[PDB]
């Protein structure tokens, strides 16, 4: 399997799915170095963040759990078509690329956050992660390029 994935069984259903350990993506299907890859994110700080302040809310006091609820339903938005990436990252989230649909532009290893570095290296193109957690809150990120 490639980088980061291993195999699981569904709790609810038993049927065997896979997971990213660095990415935090998981799906049923199973899954199938560049100097630069380019993504978009969608933030969601919360009262532990770096700086817990964003263009949406001057004072962010959410915890880190209610961040994560809200994570969780955008990805579910997401990924059953009744939202997208784009339009939700414009909306919600808590960083200055929102304005740009959570466009970061292109960048190479060694100039983000470690575990966003590595989320982001190891989809492929096209590819969503789930929860992935820095310093500055936790991010959904899609590798566009």
Not at 7 to 28: D, E, L, P
Not at 31 to 52: F, N
Not at 56 to 78: C, D, M, P, S
Request: hydrophobic share 30%; with cysteine; net charge positive.
């Amino acid at each position: 399997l490639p980088p980061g994935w291993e195999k699981a069984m569904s709790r609810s259903s038993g049927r065997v799915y896979y997971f990213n350990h660095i990415t935090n993506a998981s799906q049923w299907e199973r899954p199938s170095e560049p100097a630069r890859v380019r993504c978009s994110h969608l933030l969601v700080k919360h009262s532990q963040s770096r700086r817990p302040s964003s263009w949406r809310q001057e004072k962010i006091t959410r915890t880190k759990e209610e961040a994560l609820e809200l994570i969780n339903g955008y990805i579910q938005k997401i990924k059953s078509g009744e939202e997208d990436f784009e339009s939700l990252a414009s909306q919600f989230s808590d960083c200055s690329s929102a304005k740009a649909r959570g466009d970061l532009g292109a960048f190479s290893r060694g100039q983000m956050q470690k575990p966003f570095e590595d989320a982001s290296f190891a989809l492929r193109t096209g590819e969503m992660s789930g929860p992935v957690f820095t310093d500055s809150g936790i991010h959904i990120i899609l590798r566009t390029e």
